Design an enzyme around this catalytic site. Structure first.
Site, PDB file in Angstrom:
ATOM      1  CG  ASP A 113      -2.290   0.469   0.903  1.00  0.00           C
ATOM      2  OD1 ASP A 113      -3.234  -0.281   0.906  1.00  0.00           O
ATOM      3  OD2 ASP A 113      -2.441   1.646   0.734  1.00  0.00           O
TER       4      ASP A 113
ATOM      5  CG  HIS B 285      -5.427   3.679   1.209  1.00  0.00           C
ATOM      6  ND1 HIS B 285      -4.919   2.497   0.709  1.00  0.00           N
ATOM      7  CD2 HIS B 285      -6.755   3.667   0.917  1.00  0.00           C
ATOM      8  CE1 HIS B 285      -5.895   1.795   0.157  1.00  0.00           C
ATOM      9  NE2 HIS B 285      -7.020   2.477   0.281  1.00  0.00           N
TER      10      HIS B 285
ATOM     11  CG  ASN C  33     -13.903   1.130  -3.932  1.00  0.00           C
ATOM     12  OD1 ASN C  33     -14.332   0.162  -3.305  1.00  0.00           O
ATOM     13  ND2 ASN C  33     -12.794   1.768  -3.581  1.00  0.00           N
TER      14      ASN C  33
ATOM     15  CB  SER D 275      -9.500   0.107   0.318  1.00  0.00           C
ATOM     16  OG  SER D 275      -8.829   0.265  -0.930  1.00  0.00           O
TER      17      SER D 275
END
Ligand SMILES: [Ca+2]
Ligand SMILES: [Ca+2]
Length: 279
Positions: free
Chosen positions: A39, A69, A161, A224
């Site tokens: 990430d 994130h 998404n 996520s």
């Protein structure tokens, strides 16, 4: 063990029904297993990680998470308060920049890195990799995910998404890894969650409270956030000896809550991740 007033998602994966607030789990808590978070990096110095997190590789000028994130996803895997596997070892691999963006070649490099690096670590209960990222279809990105899975790592990836069929996204569309959809606290498919035959399992992804940079916390939404719930659960079950890296995804699907979710399109599994804990 029991955590009272838990985040709704932790409570949800230890219950057969929605609406509870206690997280029930075995005290071993993923000890002896390792989870790579691939990430934006991890703020390892965050008190919630208790010293169990470290950066092992960056592809940019620094290893620091300047975005938040990665720190959020890592917290759901294994922070004390917000995490599924509260005693697991966390490893950070920074393939996304501080705007949350990354090139496909860099993402592929990070996956090949983990496949090799795991041989230098002490992880007697097994290795998990959590990938809360993705983009348009690419057979090179899929192929890297399948390599990572095949080398003996449990690979979990976000469905995406776009409220669309995940067959057009990578690495979501690689069938050999574990592709994770998102649900909300009322057992509805998250309105943003991708779907499709390639999905393996759903996890909590709407309004997820977790660790953030600057030593803080915040609630955000996405596939996520569903992905690390599943990665954490896998590490937890591997430590208990219920399953292995190669068969963890299938074991989680087999032991899931079935039929509980609403707004699932025909042809998409109706399975919600579940730890089957009994005191
Ligand atoms: Ca139920
Ligand atoms: Ca799969």
């Amino acid at each position: 063990a029991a955590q009272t007033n838990a985040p709704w998602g932790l409570a949800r994966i230890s219950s057969t029904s929605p609406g509870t607030s206690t997280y029930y789990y075995d005290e071993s808590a993923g000890q002896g297993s390792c989870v790579y978070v691939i990430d934006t990096g991890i703020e390892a110095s965050h008190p919630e990680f208790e010293g169990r997190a470290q950066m092992v590789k960056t592809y940019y000028y620094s290893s620091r998470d300047g975005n938040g994130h990665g720190t959020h996803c890592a917290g759901t895997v294994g922070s004390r308060t917000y995490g599924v596997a509260k005693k697991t070892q966390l490893f950070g691999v920074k393939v996304l920049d501080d705007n949350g963006s990354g090139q496909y070649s860099t993402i592929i490099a990070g996956m090949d890195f983990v496949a090799s690096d795991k041989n230098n670590r002490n992880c007697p209960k097994g290795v998990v990799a959590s990938l809360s990222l993705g983009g348009g279809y690419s057979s090179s990105v899929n192929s890297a995910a399948a390599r990572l899975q095949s080398s003996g790592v449990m690979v979990a990836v976000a469905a995406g998404n776009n409220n669309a069929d995940a067959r057009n996204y990578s690495p979501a569309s690689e069938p050999s890894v574990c592709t994770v959809g998102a649900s909300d606290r009322y057992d509805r498919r998250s309105s943003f969650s991708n779907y499709g035959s390639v999905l393996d399992i759903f996890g909590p992804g709407t309004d997820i409270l977790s660790t953030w940079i600057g030593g803080s916390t915040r609630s955000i939404s996405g596939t996520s956030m569903a992905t690390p719930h599943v990665a954490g659960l896998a590490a937890y079950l591997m430590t208990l000896g219920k399953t292995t890296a190669a068969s963890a995804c299938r074991y989680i699907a087999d032991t899931a809550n079935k039929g509980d979710l609403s707004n699932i399109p025909f042809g998409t599994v109706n399975l919600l991740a579940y730890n089957n804990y009994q005191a």
